[PDB]
Structure formats: C-alpha cells, structure tokens
Design a protein around this ligand. Structure first.
Ligand code: RKX
Ligand code: CA
Length: 223
C-alpha cells in the first residue's frame, strides 16, 4: 500500500496473509473454512495466517492453518488477468472472534464513487522497495468504467474495476495481491494488477467480486 496508513492491530479482521515460508499475497476470510484471493497468487504449500498485524512477530491473535485445496477460477487467463480469483479451503475451520472474522460477499455490485478500504502488507514505495511488517490501509473510491478504460485502453474487462486516485500517490502495490477491497462492509474487489504503483493516470485494477458470487457459493457448497 503506497500512501496509506497503519490500520491498527486486528482492525481488518478478515485480512489474511498467504505464507509459503514468507508473506506473498493477501486474501480475505469469507467463512470459517474458506479464503478468497487472486488466481495470480496460486502456488502449492500455502499456509493461511489469520489474525495478523506484524507478520514477522507472534503477537498472540494469530491462527496458522494450512490450505487443503486451492481452486483457481476455471476461466482465469494469466496473460490478461481476466477472472483473477481463487478459493482456498482451510484444513480446519478458523476460530472466529472480534480479531478474526469473515467478510460478507456482496448482493450487489458497488457503483463508481463508492469509498472502499484496501489493505495489505505490500510495498509502500512507488519507486524502490520498502515492505512494512504491519498491515497498511487505504481508503479509495471506485472509479467510473470510462475513467478505468481510458487509463488502461484495451485491458479492462467486465470482471475488473479501477479504484484509487488518477493523481497518483495512493495505491495498492506488489505484495498486496489477492487482498481485499471492502465497501460498505462487503467484499467488492481483490487486488489484481496495475501499471507500477501509485503512478499518475494508472489506478489499481481489482477483480470484480460481485460477478463471482454464484461461482463462489456453488464451489464452497460442493468442496
Ligand atoms: C503485482 O501486483 C500489483 C498489484 C497492484 C498494483 C497496483 N494497484 N498498482 C500493481 C501491481
Ligand atoms: Ca504476527
């Protein structure tokens, strides 16, 4: 997260860290046994870390639970990042409390102008590299499809939306991948891609979760 703020410990209780020996992606807890992330975060040997603030220090609210199964969206295209969404089933259900809690799936797609909360442990610099140990937050609006398409000609599908600031300075970044965009207490987006980080006229692009709710619900019901 570039140009964000320190969320505060366990203020974003649905945020997960995907760990393969190190943090490599975020995710969202959507019920006690399932995490939603980006398909570009796929790998084998994932440990889901819930209840994190400082990902380098055991602070006492963590749950570390191995993945039993990963399901990449059947139509994920790694070239275009269309359908950049993946489900991860936990080996055992998380213990839900005020600091580890699921986020609701949307019943409706959020409109342009809606203010959302983006969070993650990704890079905090637009030039060079500085990875924070504590969770960062950014409030950002959803941009119009026309501003999103104008920023990324020929690259925005109906399964993507832009959020952030055309002026730059404030964006998600590498390491925020797979993390949540929460609007009005519902998961509306997944950190997917962008051209650099926090660049002028190059907002963040997010998987449009509201297009995937039937796939998510049907998948969870049968797995
Ligand atoms: C490789 O991951 C990302 C994720 C987000 C962004 C961005 N929001 N600019 C860029 C690269
Ligand atoms: Ca920790």
């Amino acid at each position: 997260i570039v140009g964000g703020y320190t969320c505060g410990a366990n203020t974003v209780p649905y945020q997960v860290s995907l760990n393969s020996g190190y943090h490599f992606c975020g995710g969202s807890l959507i019920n006690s046994q399932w995490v939603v992330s980006a398909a570009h975060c796929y790998k084998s040997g994932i440990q889901v870390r819930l209840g994190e603030d400082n990902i380098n220090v055991v602070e006492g609210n963590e749950q570390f639970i191995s993945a039993s199964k990963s399901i990449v969206h059947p139509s994920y295209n790694s070239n275009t990042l269309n359908n950049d969404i993946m489900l991860i089933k936990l080996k055992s259900a998380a213990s839900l409390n005020s600091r580890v809690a699921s986020i609701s799936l949307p019943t409706s797609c959020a409109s342009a102008g809606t203010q959302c909360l983006i969070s993650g442990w990704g890079n905090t610099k637009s030039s060079g590299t500085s990875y924070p140990d504590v969770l960062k937050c950014l409030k950002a609006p959803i941009l119009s499809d026309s501003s999103c398409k104008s920023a990324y000609p020929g690259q925005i599908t109906s399964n993507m939306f832009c959020a952030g600031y055309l002026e730059g300075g404030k964006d998600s970044c590498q390491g925020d991948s797979g993390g949540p965009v929460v609007c009005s207490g519902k998961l509306q987006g997944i950190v997917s891609w962008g051209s650099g980080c926090a660049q002028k006229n190059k907002p963040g692009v997010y998987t449009k979760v509201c297009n995937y709710v039937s796939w998510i619900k049907q998948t969870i019901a049968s797995n």
